[PDB]
Design a binder for these strands. Structure first.
Ligand SMILES: [Ca+2]
Ligand SMILES: [Ca+2]
Length: 887
DNA sequence: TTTT
DNA sequence: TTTTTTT
């Protein structure tokens, strides 16, 4: 047969309604033998009003169209070009249907022989990609998009990206044969005949790169590390000097001093705390301090970071830089927890043919291909979202490992005699021994940005009951004889009555009813929970808010748990002679559900500090009930302090009232803790406006008005970039709209706080030299800032946490004076992290909150300004000063 | 999510 | 013995 031809089709349209919209541009790229042979592109004219939204999107305007044909002209042309091809397009559903109707209105019956959806092929072939949006996908794969949203290019990109995947689908038939039989259950589009054609026209050859077929799974043999080559007999200084010289960096005394500090504390197995608040130097500091510790003693150093950008700059920027200083080739490994690695027990998921969620079938195909690639086996690097992550998190939670399972976690175990630098995240470090065993693998660790460590303790200390999780679990049992487990039990009982299996009698009808009675006892619970949620503080905010409610009795909820737990055990007792796999897995499922409820009931029967949560007031389908099963002070000490010989704490903000006591208090027994600490100060200037009235939310409008007035004053005196740290949503949007209205900020682009691609806002902010400013919320720490000229930071108010903050809710039981011991030291450290970032060039700071001057605790706040120059007065003294700095 |  | 909504 003539090799099939592929029509990769793209349509720009006026809308999404199949019956109410027209094609306004069709681009086609044709493909055969993994190669482009022809392309088709013709703007299509529509007598409809193209709404402005499609114009900013498609770059297409109405005046362009009046010279393009209507669709019925080219209609016979297009059909005659695509009639005998295979139809291909991203979200083919949307594409094919539109061109199917447009052909119908020209008396043309398009019934294509074979349909292909690249969204499926891309999900399988590129399973580690963060998004499958055709634009960003093309960017992650060295594909140049000359222009975005054009169909003649969206059709080429979608065709090129196809040709990669088709060439990537060229490995081993034992694996390709897996995907043929898995492709069938795709139950979406005709793709099997593609693999069926690569099986026929296949060329057999072994490959040693990929390892043996563990069971049936084929994978890539992780490559271990070897003995490190570190020949250096100098001192830490001579290394530093050479290093700073070789990299073309500037010598810094305190940095290298810091470096000698860290080595000294390790060699002696000590426990320091180092508030540095330095610049980029800290990154190289650790590296050389840890690199030295190994050359001298041969021990290993874990580096637990807070974020990824910190972990990366030191992993892939400052490591190949350091490895030019010599033939160093040091070893750094991103050591995560044990659960976050693959056990190659996915053969069990593979054996789960009953899986019909489709999304999982893709995961089955994703895992099969990801596993011949990943050098680490880190699950998260396979970005997992929605249902997929929920099933895979569910299977991994109850996985009963086998005697000889090839687990990717054990690569860390058998190879940390050779990683001089191991790097982690604080959230992994504090997991339980069974969850995370790094204390048994690394004896020496340096926690970075350690003031956020108790905040990470707060999420590993609470357990949760999720309406969503319970709903999914019930879903995996079924409520009728046509649903997963219940459907299988049917075949079992059927096979007792028909195939005569040695199974005992099973009341499938009773179980089905029994299972429906469970479904109602659950809803009944989330109603008693829900109504006291609807009967509480209602916050009306465009951003969906987490209305965490804290006041409630726990008797009626405890009576609905005792009801639902007792019936689960009764449904289990129908099955005691459980020798069959299906009825075994069914019991394991029903049993795990019983433990989720039993654990919360066991936490609420006792009286553990407990609270409810919800995500939407209208959607009762997102209720979550939380309980405090452990104590943070306990979690920190045992999982970290007690289980580490040399533990060096270092952060930009670790000192309160000049006393680390406000940090060591959580470490009970307060075992001896060595203390430590280490131009910009005077290059900076603070201004406390006096005209500003006090913070009164009752009347938040004249406060934001005084803020825009200063933003007005600054922006007109000197157009350097600005930064207004905000702690409130209402207030941040109030000034962001008040900025966009006044014409003084014409030629000025304001940026709000958006979680999606938040980093992008920073990119655009630097993209301009003097036309940018931005309000934000609790984002002080991460941000760095650079420009030409003056530098301003405006803090709206002292960053206190309300008594309605769950962080406070979970911590109140754990402190005597929850204000003096916790929320005040947190407010200060957060406050002094906006400041720390500003100082660098010269700059100023503006603190609008007058609590800093006329409050009893003002002392602790003005302590963070001892090295600056404070001043107070009108917006007039602010103007003169703003001119004074330029002088 | 992922296509206008 | 002092305080208001993100990450
Ligand atoms: Ca399309
Ligand atoms: Ca397009």
């Amino acid at each position: 047969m003539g090799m099939a031809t592929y029509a990769v089709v793209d349509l720009e349209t006026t809308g999404n309604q199949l019956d109410f919209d027209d094609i306004i541009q069709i681009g086609i790229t044709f493909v055969r033998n993994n190669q482009i042979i022809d392309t088709y592109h013709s703007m299509i004219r529509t007598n409809l009003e193209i709404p402005p939204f499609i114009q900013a999107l498609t770059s297409i305007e109405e005046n362009m169209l009046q010279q393009a044909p209507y669709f019925n002209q080219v209609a016979q042309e297009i059909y005659d070009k695509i009639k005998d091809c295979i139809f291909v397009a991203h979200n083919v559903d949307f594409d094919l249907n539109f061109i199917k109707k447009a052909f119908k209105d020209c008396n043309i019956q398009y019934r294509p022989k074979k349909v292909i959806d690249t969204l499926e092929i891309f999900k399988i072939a590129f399973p580690t990609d963060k998004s499958y949006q055709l634009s960003e996908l093309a960017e992650a794969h060295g594909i140049t998009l000359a222009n975005a949203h054009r169909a003649d290019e969206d059709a080429a990109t979608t065709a090129k990206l196809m040709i990669l995947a088709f060439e990537k689908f060229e490995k081993l038939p034992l694996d390709t044969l897996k995907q043929l039989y898995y492709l069938s259950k795709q139950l979406k589009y005709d793709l099997y005949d593609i693999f069926f054609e690569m099986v026929r026209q296949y060329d057999a050859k072994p490959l040693d790169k990929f390892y043996e077929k563990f069971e049936q799974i084929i994978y890539r043999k992780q490559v271990d590390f070897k003995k490190p080559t570190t020949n250096y007999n100098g001192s830490l200084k001579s290394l530093y000097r050479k290093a700073v010289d070789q990299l073309g960096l500037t010598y810094r005394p305190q940095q290298l001093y810091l470096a000698e500090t860290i080595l000294d504390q390790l060699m002696h197995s000590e426990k320091a705390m180092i508030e540095a608040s330095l610049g980029s130097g800290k990154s190289l500091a650790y590296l050389l301090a840890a690199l030295m510790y190994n050359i001298e003693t041969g021990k290993h150093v874990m580096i637990s970071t807070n974020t990824k950008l910190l972990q990366s700059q030191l992993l892939e920027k400052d490591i190949p830089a350091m490895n030019e200083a010599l033939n160093f080739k040091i070893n750094a490994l991103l050591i995560k927890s044990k659960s976050d690695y693959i056990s190659l027990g996915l053969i069990s998921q593979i054996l789960k043919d009953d899986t019909s969620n489709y999304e999982v079938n893709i995961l089955k195909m994703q895992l099969l291909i990801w596993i011949t690639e990943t050098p680490s086996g880190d699950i998260q690097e396979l970005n997992l979202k929605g249902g997929q992550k929920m099933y895979f998190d569910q299977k991994i939670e109850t996985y009963v490992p086998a005697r000889h399972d090839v687990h990717y976690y054990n690569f860390i175990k058998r190879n940390a005699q050779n990683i001089q630098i191991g790097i982690t995240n604080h959230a992994h470090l504090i997991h339980s021994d069974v969850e995370n065993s790094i204390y048994q693998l690394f004896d020496d660790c340096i926690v970075d940005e350690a003031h956020r460590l108790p905040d990470y303790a707060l999420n590993q200390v609470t357990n949760e009951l999720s309406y969503a999780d319970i709903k999914y679990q019930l879903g995996l049992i079924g409520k009728n004889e046509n649903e997963k487990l219940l459907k299988a039990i049917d075949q079992l009982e059927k096979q007792r009555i028909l195939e005569k299996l040695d199974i005992a009698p099973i009341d499938i009808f009773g179980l089905k009813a029994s299972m429906n009675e469970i479904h109602e006892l659950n809803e009944q619970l989330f109603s008693t929970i829900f109504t006291i949620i609807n009967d509480s503080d209602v916050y009306d905010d465009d951003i969906h808010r987490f209305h965490n409610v804290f006041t409630f009795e726990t008797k009626d909820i405890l009576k609905d748990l005792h009801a639902i737990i007792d019936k689960l055990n009764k449904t289990l007792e129908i099955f005691n002679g459980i020798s069959h796999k299906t009825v075994k897995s069914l019991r394991k499922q029903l049993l795990y559900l019983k433990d989720k409820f039993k654990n919360i009931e066991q936490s609420l029967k006792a009286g553990h500090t407990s609270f409810i949560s919800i995500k939407n007031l209208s959607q009762k389908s997102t209720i979550r009930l939380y309980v405090k099963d452990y104590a943070v002070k306990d979690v920190l000490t045992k999982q970290v302090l007690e289980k580490f010989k040399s533990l060096i704490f270092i952060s930009g903000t670790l000192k309160f009232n000049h006393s680390f006591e406000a940090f060591k208090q959580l470490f009970n027994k307060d075992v001896h803790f060595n203390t430590f600490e280490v131009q910009s100060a005077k290059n900076t200037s603070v201004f406390i406006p006096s005209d500003v009235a006090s913070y009164q939310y009752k009347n938040i409008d004249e406060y934001v008005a005084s803020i825009v007035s200063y933003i007005i004053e600054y922006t007109t005196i000197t157009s350097s970039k600005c930064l207004v740290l905000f702690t409130s949503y209402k207030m941040m949007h109030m000034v962001q709209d008040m900025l966009n209205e006044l014409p003084e900020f014409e030629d000025y682009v304001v940026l709000t706080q958006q979680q999606n691609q938040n980093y992008k806002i920073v990119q655009q902010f630097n993209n301009f030299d003097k036309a940018i400013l931005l309000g934000t919320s609790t984002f002080f720490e991460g941000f760095d800032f650079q420009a030409n000229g003056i530098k301003c930071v405006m803090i709206a108010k002292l960053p206190f946490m309300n008594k309605h903050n769950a962080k406070y809710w979970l911590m109140d039981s754990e402190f005597t004076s929850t204000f003096k011991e916790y929320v005040l030291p947190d407010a200060v450290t957060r406050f002094r992290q906006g400041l720390g970032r500003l100082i660098r060039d010269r700059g100023i700071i503006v603190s609008f909150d007058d609590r800093l001057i006329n409050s009893n605790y003002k002392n602790f706040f003005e302590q963070t300004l001892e090295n600056y120059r404070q001043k107070k007065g009108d917006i007039q003294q602010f103007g003169k000063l703003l001119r004074q700095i330029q002088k």
